[PDB]
Amino acid sequence: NKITPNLAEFAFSLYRQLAHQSNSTNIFFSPVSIATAFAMLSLGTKADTHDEILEGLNFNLTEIPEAQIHEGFQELLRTLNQPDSQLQLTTGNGLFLSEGLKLVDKFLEDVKKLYHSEAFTVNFGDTEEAKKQINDYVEKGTQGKIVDLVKELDRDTVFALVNYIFFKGKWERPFEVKDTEEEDFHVDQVTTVKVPMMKRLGMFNIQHAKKLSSWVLLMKYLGNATAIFFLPDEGKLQHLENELTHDIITKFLENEDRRSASLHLPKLSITGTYDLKSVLGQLGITKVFSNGADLSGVTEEAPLKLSKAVHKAVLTIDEKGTEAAPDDDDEAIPR
Amino acid sequence: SIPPEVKFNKPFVFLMIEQNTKSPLFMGKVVNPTQ
């Protein structure tokens, strides 16, 4: 899939913006879900509004033709929904449209074909009913992990685009629950909490990487996924965060070598909820949220702008594997 | 050789990669491991 290196650099770009936004808190997000939502939205935009979005997702538009971007997403999404038998992985997209809104037919055709979007009509005027239809859809897609996503919803909303993934993978070799023991986790130099620390003696793809000043551990899932964990040496977290690139990840993923190691990894459950406007603005995605946004590819009835772009993601790690689910909620109003 | 011990008991970064596409499905950093 040819949009991959673009998505990997978009992950590191967005990560760095979120870390600079709040540098001492948990971070968890889905680069693929956000890139899917905004690439789908770009089908309804024109001119610089459009180009800012795809460039912000790290596409060069004078290098990759736009048809190939969208077909790249179309295939990505199809692969995501056809995992190996041992991995649970799904994704979907719902486009909740104001009842009565006259759309540009080509938009509705393109989101259905390229992004597999399920279109629904709703009355944003009945705020409790519209919130329930969106939140039920997200709760179903995320298999119960993101509940009551939308709490407040503008009566003048023209559309809400909602994109999710569901992930549940099993470690290729699970931890034994009997071996999990409470240990100290050093949040910072003056703060220690207790955590259930899982452990196993195993053959791991594990190395200490000079360029990152970090241990680098690959944890294979059964089926078509791997988790890569980076443990920075003392004082080196910011350095590690700055120095990750797609070429570095690729080199780690391509190496087959394993060595005997005693791994201790915490069981955990974390969540991120993010307003993406400012961070995506730092990535250059600005006009689509503004009083100049050109969403005339969506509707020619009246100008729009994107009012809201929120991302929520949940992660659970335990002895069996990992479960994770993001959702994007991108809402447009008349401008 | 004595097997190394690698213990995730301080902040760490991670990424989850889908194997067919190599796409980054998730990225994060754990600073405080909630339960």
Looking at CA atoms only, how far is residue A122 from chain B in angstroms? 30
Is the domain covering A172-266 a CATH 1.10.1520.10 domain? no
Looking at CA atoms only, how far is residue B6 from chain A in angstroms? 5
Query: Reduced to 3 states, what is the DSSP secondary structure of residue A277?
Result: helix
A322 vs A316: CA distance, rounded Å: 6
The CATH class that applies to domain B1-35 reads mainly beta
Which residue ranges make up each domain of chain B? 1-35
Q: Judge whether B5 is closer than 8 Å to chain A, CB to CB.
A: yes
If phi over 0 gives left and psi between -120 and 50 gives alpha, with beta otherwise, what is residue A138? alpha
First to last CA, chain A: 37
Looking at CA atoms only, how far is residue B1 from chain A in angstroms? 9
Task: State which residue of chain B sits closest to A260, comparing Cα positions.
Answer: B3
Which residue ranges make up each domain of chain A? 1-171+267-335, 172-266
The structure was resolved to a resolution in Å of: 1.5
Q: Which residues of chain B have a CB within 8 Å of the CB of A263? A: 6-7
Is the domain covering A1-171+267-335 a CATH 3.30.390.10 domain? no
Q: Which two tokens stand for residue A161?
A: 């685009």
Interface contacts A/B by beta carbons within 8 Å: 174
Q: Judge whether B2 is closer than 8 Å to chain A, CB to CB.
A: no
Long-range CB pairs of A282-286 (<8 Å, 24+ gap) are A282/A17, A283/A13, A283/A14, A283/A17, A283/A56, A284/A52, A284/A55, A284/A56, A285/A38, A285/A52, A285/A53, A285/A56, A286/A52
